[PDB]
Amino acid sequence: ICSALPTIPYHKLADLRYLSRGASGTVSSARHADWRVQVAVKHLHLDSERKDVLREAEILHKARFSYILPILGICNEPEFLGIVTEYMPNGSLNELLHRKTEYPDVAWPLRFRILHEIALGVNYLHNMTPPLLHHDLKTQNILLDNEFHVKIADFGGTIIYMPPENYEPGQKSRASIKHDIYSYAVITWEVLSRKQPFEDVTNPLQIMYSVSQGRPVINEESLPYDIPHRARMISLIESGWAQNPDERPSFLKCLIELEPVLRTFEEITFLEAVIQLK
Amino acid sequence: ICSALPTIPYHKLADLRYLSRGASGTVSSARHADWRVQVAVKHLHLDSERKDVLREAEILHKARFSYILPILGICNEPEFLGIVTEYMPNGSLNELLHRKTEYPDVAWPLRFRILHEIALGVNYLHNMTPPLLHHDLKTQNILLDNEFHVKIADFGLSKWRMTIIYMPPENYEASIKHDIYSYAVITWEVLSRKQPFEDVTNPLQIMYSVSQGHRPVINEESLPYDIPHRARMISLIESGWAQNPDERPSFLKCLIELEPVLRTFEEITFLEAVIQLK
Numbered sequence A: 001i002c003s004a005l006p007t008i009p010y011h012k013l014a015d016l017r018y019l020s021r022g023a024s025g026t027v028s029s030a031r032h033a034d035w036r037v038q039v040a041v042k043h044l045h046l047d048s049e050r051k052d053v054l055r056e057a058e059i060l061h062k063a064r065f066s067y068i069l070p071i072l073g074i075c076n077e078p079e080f081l082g083i084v085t086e087y088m089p090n091g092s093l094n095e096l097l098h099r100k101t102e103y104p105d106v107a108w109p110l111r112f113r114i115l116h117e118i119a120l121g122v123n124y125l126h127n128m129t130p131p132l133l134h135h136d137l138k139t140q141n142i143l144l145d146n147e148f149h150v151k152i153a154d155f156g157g158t159i160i161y162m163p164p165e166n167y168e169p170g171q172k173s174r175a176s177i178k179h180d181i182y183s184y185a186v187i188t189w190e191v192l193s194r195k196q197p198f199e200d201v202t203n204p205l206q207i208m209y210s211v212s213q214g215r216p217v218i219n220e221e222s223l224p225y226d227i228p229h230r231a232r233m234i235s236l237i238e239s240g241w242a243q244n245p246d247e248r249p250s251f252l253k254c255l256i257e258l259e260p261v262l263r264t265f266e267e268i269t270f271l272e273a274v275i276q277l278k
Numbered sequence B: 001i002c003s004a005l006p007t008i009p010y011h012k013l014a015d016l017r018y019l020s021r022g023a024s025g026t027v028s029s030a031r032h033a034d035w036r037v038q039v040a041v042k043h044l045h046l047d048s049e050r051k052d053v054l055r056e057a058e059i060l061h062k063a064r065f066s067y068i069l070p071i072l073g074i075c076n077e078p079e080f081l082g083i084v085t086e087y088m089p090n091g092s093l094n095e096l097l098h099r100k101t102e103y104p105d106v107a108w109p110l111r112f113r114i115l116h117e118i119a120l121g122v123n124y125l126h127n128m129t130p131p132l133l134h135h136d137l138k139t140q141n142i143l144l145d146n147e148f149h150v151k152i153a154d155f156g157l158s159k160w161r162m163t164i165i166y167m168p169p170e171n172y173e174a175s176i177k178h179d180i181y182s183y184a185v186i187t188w189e190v191l192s193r194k195q196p197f198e199d200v201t202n203p204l205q206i207m208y209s210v211s212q213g214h215r216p217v218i219n220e221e222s223l224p225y226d227i228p229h230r231a232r233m234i235s236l237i238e239s240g241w242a243q244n245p246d247e248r249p250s251f252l253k254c255l256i257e258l259e260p261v262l263r264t265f266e267e268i269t270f271l272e273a274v275i276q277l278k
């Protein structure tokens, strides 16, 4: 069973506002004139360019799942080229974790749910035919919906989530199935700590040197003893960011370890975590 | 840009417990072994039977939107035939409105959000090429997700895709004014928490009354004066269920009416209404 991705005429996008700018182009918010929903527009502002947008659209359309940014349509016009997705109103994980004045507390149930949902999403990509690999997993690429549920995106930067064997890339390093789990381990650490990994280091180049020798600090300072399931978590972090790519777990194995942890949290506590953020 | 609907092997559908039966098919709650998610399966409990299921999967896959039940894949084997969708943990709108012991209080902010989302999902269906017309809209087909957001479904106890309370009179014996009629009945039901035609014993007695231009009661008893935007909501109801199909509004008009009503609610009030249910 096949399904075509809708084509959205640029003029059907009303109330267009700039959100961000960088690599792969600019991101804008808008409303669909006929659908009456708020949308996000990732666009370029010539033939090779056209093919890139069409390829991203196809991946996003095929990667359709509960914890993946939902694509709504494509703008493929002489005057405009862009990807139209659902609008994520609560920014990224990065902004939740590090805007500490705006967000004083981020309750453990919400933190563990975010971790469980990142793993559910990456796991799904890894189970496609053929497997889909992110290879640029970072806190900026973890979008949060209205109820602070995860949608994995790719904004198209930091080296802190990169496995050391990816530093000098090749045909084997780009085909690595143990890259995402390294990034996940650092994300897992950054979520439980609310600390910028390798904060004390001066140069990203020095971080690369440090990393290649053999990680961000696992102590009482960074990770206090009151962290729910601390031991099992630390064991998962250490295991995921292990210098030997073969000494790294699958996302399925992490999920199986995470499933009992999430059950120790009462359903109400997730709703209370979110009300606390508003 | 085409997307193939994933094929799920029956053996990946762990803990397959039944939920509800019908003359056409059955609905069961499984758990995907690889994806680690709770799912719903609508299966046949062969030539024609196969074409019927695949046509429903083709419709659901093409109808993908924020307020339509998301299809995760098809389970097409000589042993088993079923559609895998996401699992809606909070039941249906019928249950929320009429299980008054379970839910003594369903706050206005949530009621309006539900009505807005029914209209968004129906409006999207009508905007497809060719337009998809539900024609069997009822509270039972309005499913409630983890966060009490709407997912429009089509339960098929009688037939796969291709009560008379929500049916317009002209339909007793193609119409693009049916779903709006059904929508007007649902709106009345949501705001009153009453069963349409409470004293009427026989469905033929409803069919007779309706054909004579009579509708569910609109007074202080059914619709209290304390209802936010009462006058405005009654006008929408009365337009929606008009005897003359042509006097009924489009979903665009209906959404343009709803939009300023929903803006009057602070975002936190929706969260608070949902927590009050937990």
Ligand SMILES: CC(C)(C)c1cc(NC(=O)Nc2ccc(Oc3ccncc3)cc2)no1
Pocket: A019, A027, A040, A041, A042, A056, A059, A060, A063, A068, A069, A083, A085, A086, A087, A088, A089, A133, A134, A143, A152, A153, A154, A155
């Ligand atoms: C399948 C996966 C590997 C995860 C992926 C995502 C992707 N494109 C993308 O995320 N595009 C994108 C990114 C950020 C955007 O910005 C938003 C979105 C929603 N709300 C606010 C900003 C919009 C589109 N291509 O492959």
Ligand SMILES: CC(C)(C)c1cc(NC(=O)Nc2ccc(Oc3ccncc3)cc2)no1
Pocket: B027, B040, B041, B042, B056, B059, B060, B063, B068, B069, B083, B085, B086, B087, B088, B089, B134, B143, B152, B153, B154, B155, B156, B161
């Ligand atoms: C586009 C639209 C007209 C709205 C539609 C729905 C549909 N099929 C369907 O909903 N099938 C279905 C219904 C109920 C199910 O049972 C569930 C689903 C989720 N959670 C609990 C029970 C499973 C599949 N075909 O066209």
